[PDB]
Design a protein around this ligand. Structure first.
Ligand SMILES: Nc1ncnc2c1ncn2[C@@H]1O[C@H](COP(=O)(O)OP(=O)(O)OP(=O)(O)O)[C@@H](O)[C@H]1O
Lengths: 420, 106, 149
């Protein structure tokens, strides 16, 4: 049979390329095929649309995102192929093999051969496609792993009816270039252009936002009798275009990031829709100026600390960025962008005593505040396992940036700016 | 025109299956003999295939970035250039961004 | 002679410069700004030191296809024209409205009737460049408003 081509916009080369490598004849389709495209390039959507356009094809869908490692990857292949073969040919009497016995790729080959032997009595050769979306997204991955999937078809009995025609999708490009010499038929996906992203989001989210409860509540509240779905779509498109033109430099030509801004700002934008803003998007934009001037992607006196805690933090920041050379020069009566350095506990205590406003000394409250600072992730250590503060090999460093310590000093009225 | 592609392919790399990997799309994409007679002669589709093969290298990724992304990239590259080790961090990139915007406004 | 409002404009612009050195500007540069404003007015018929002269002196000391200066000159004019109707609340401006206004602002600098179309076309190209830089936002007339940046 002849494959029918889908009408996916902004991909009208790859949808034609897929008709080249996928066909009803298993003697034509290659044993491997890789589709390459970064996140949000439409690979999964395009491939799923192509398969849904030609139901006569036979496929298995798995996601290494869910399948953490390679052993589940093989086990799911075996189990899903078994289920699919039962579903496609219930009439043929067949037996079962345990999909949980697959421990090595050879065992996968063995189980697949054993299953395919059962279906030897099939009338014609069958073309089967195994689809792994995001092959390089596997959490435990190595270079030698992918080679095991390229040269696997030829270990099967070549006279068998069931032929496995693997399909892979890849995100990165440093991954695919390692396998260039294999000359695997590869189809490519570039990043969508700004106009393409703008058109796609309008095509996608318009119907999603035309039927939300908030707008149809606000229409009732505002008694908009002349509101129509055509104008509803126009309002949604104006919203999307405004977000795109305001935040393309912030998000890039990325579909996922813009979708979430469209979701977040949508209630607040709706709150400003009134009787006067039905026909003038300019006035609505003017009313919504403060919504556009801020991304609002933020999750939201920034750090409530005791005076001892504040002075300890002030001293620690000096320790982590001032050379040990200058301690006696500055504090005894006798750089903004680099990563902080380590410091010892005695240096911190000495600088704290020197800067605390007759001696303050070190009581239990001082060390308690110091430990609170560590617990609050304001001071970092040089250890990650079996935390033991009293071990004489652990050093300290500051995790608080300049913008916060500036305001802390302002609240303390301590002039750090003159020490550098 | 077709022999032009053949010679260029030969002079670039001499693995025949690699050239077959490009010829096959041309044949499969062909819809009918009448259109095939026109398509096979000029053979403009191999250029499209070749550019697709290169669409995800450094140039293809650089062509799609926005103005802000490109400016931050330029600033980070400047920081790396002024660095003996060629390394940079976010703070230095943003400081160079601030300085370049101040200069542009000034 | 310094105008009364020029004093406020001068102290504001001096604070603006002093903020940027957090060489380093001293009060000698304030006296230099007064002196350069005096010199610029000295090359003119009016003793009134308008804020424009102090702005020119500020630019000359602080700064230490189409050509760069000619293009950048139109940007300030167009931005200020749009910010004017922003404060007034009047109707927003299209591209043609900006081009005609800008041509009216420079009637005396045009050289010939042929240069009219040249400057109109250059203004449209400059508008397109500004939109590409996202300093002007296009909304739907083809409405141009100050970009959120
Ligand atoms: N031409 C198009 N027309 C309509 N929608 C499109 C088009 N291209 C992409 N999209 C949308 O963009 C979304 C991007 O998600 P997609 O399924 O492509 O993820 P992915 O890139 O494969 O995933 P991952 O980054 O997690 O590996 C699709 O789900 C689809 O809704």
């Amino acid at each position: 049979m002849n494959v029918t081509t889908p009408e996916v916009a902004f991909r009208e080369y790859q949808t034609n390329c897929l008709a080249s490598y996928i066909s009803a004849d298993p003697d034509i389709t290659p044993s491997n095929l890789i589709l390459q495209g970064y996140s949000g390039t439409g690979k999964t959507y395009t491939l799923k649309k192509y398969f849904n356009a030609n139901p006569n094809l036979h496929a298995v869908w798995l996601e290494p995102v869910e399948l953490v490692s390679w052993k589940p990857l093989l086990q799911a292949i075996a189990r899903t192929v078994q289920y699919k073969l039962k579903t496609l040919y219930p009439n043929i009497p067949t037996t079962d093999y345990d999909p949980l016995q697959v421990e090595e790729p050879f065992l996968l080959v063995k189980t697949l051969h054993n299953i395919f032997v059962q279906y030897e009595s099939l009338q014609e050769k069958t073309c089967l496609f195994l689809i792994l979306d995001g092959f390089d997204s596997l959490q435990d991955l190595d270079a030698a792993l992918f080679n095991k999937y390229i040269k696997l078809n030829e270990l099967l009995p070549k006279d068998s009816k069931i032929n496995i025609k693997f399909i892979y999708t890849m995100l990165e490009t440093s991954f695919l270039q390692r396998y260039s010499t294999h000359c695997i038929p590869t189809v490519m996906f570039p990043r969508y252009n700004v106009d393409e992203v703008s058109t796609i989001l309008v095509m996608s989210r318009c119907g999603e936002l035309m039927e939300d409860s908030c707008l149809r509540k606000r229409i009732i509240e505002e008694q908009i009798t002349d509101c129509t779905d055509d104008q509803f779509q126009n309002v949604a498109a104006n919203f999307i275009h405004l977000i795109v033109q305001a935040f393309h430099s912030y998000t890039g030509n990325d579909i996922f990031a813009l979708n979430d801004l469209i979701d977040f700002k949508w209630p607040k934008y709706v709150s400003r829709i009134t009787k006067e803003n039905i026909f003038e998007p300019l006035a609505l934009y003017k009313s919504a100026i403060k919504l556009f001037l801020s991304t609002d992607d933020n999750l939201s006196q920034t750090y409530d600390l005791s005076i001892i805690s504040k002075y300890l933090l002030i001293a620690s920041y000096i320790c982590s960025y001032l050379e040990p050379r200058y301690d006696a020069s500055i504090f005894s009566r006798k750089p903004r962008y680099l990563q902080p350095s380590l410091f010892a506990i005695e240096r911190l205590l000495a600088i704290f005593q020197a800067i605390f406003p007759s001696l303050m000394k070190a009581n239990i409250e001082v060390f308690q505040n110091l430990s609170e600072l560590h617990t609050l992730k304001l001071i970092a250590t040089t250890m990650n396992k079996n935390i033991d503060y009293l071990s004489p090999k652990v050093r300290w460093k500051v995790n608080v940036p300049w913008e916060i310590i500036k305001e802390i000093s302002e609240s303390v009225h301590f002039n750090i700016s003159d020490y550098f | 025109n077709l022999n032009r592609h053949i010679r260029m392919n030969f002079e670039t790399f001499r693995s025949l299956p690699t050239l077959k990997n490009s010829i096959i799309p041309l044949v499969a994409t062909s819809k009918n003999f009448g259109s095939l007679c026109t398509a096979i002669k000029s053979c403009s589709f191999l250029d499209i295939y070749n550019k697709n093969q290169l669409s995800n290298n450094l140039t293809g990724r650089l062509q799609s970035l926005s103005d802000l992304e490109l400016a931050i990239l330029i600033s980070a590259a400047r920081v790396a250039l002024r660095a003996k080790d060629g390394s940079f961090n976010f703070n230095l990139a943003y400081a160079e961004y601030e300085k370049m915007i101040k200069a542009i406004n000034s | 002679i310094l105008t009364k409002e020029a004093r406020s404009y001068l102290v504001e612009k001096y604070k603006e410069l002093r903020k940027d050195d957090a060489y380093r500007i001293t009060v000698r540069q304030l006296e230099s700004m007064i002196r350069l404003s005096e010199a610029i007015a000295r090359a003119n018929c009016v003793d009134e030191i308008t804020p424009s002269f102090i702005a020119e002196a500020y630019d000359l000391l602080r700064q230490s296809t189409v050509t760069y200066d000619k293009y950048v000159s139109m940007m300030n004019m167009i931005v200020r024209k749009i910010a004017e109707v922003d404060r007034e609340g009047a109707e927003e401006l299209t591209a043609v409205d900006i081009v005609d206004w800008y041509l009216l602002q420079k009637e005396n600098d045009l050289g010939s009737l042929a240069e009219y179309w040249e400057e109109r076309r250059l203004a449209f190209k400059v508008i397109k460049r500004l939109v590409k830089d996202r300093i002007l936002m296009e909304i739907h007339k083809t409405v141009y408003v100050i970009h959120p940046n």
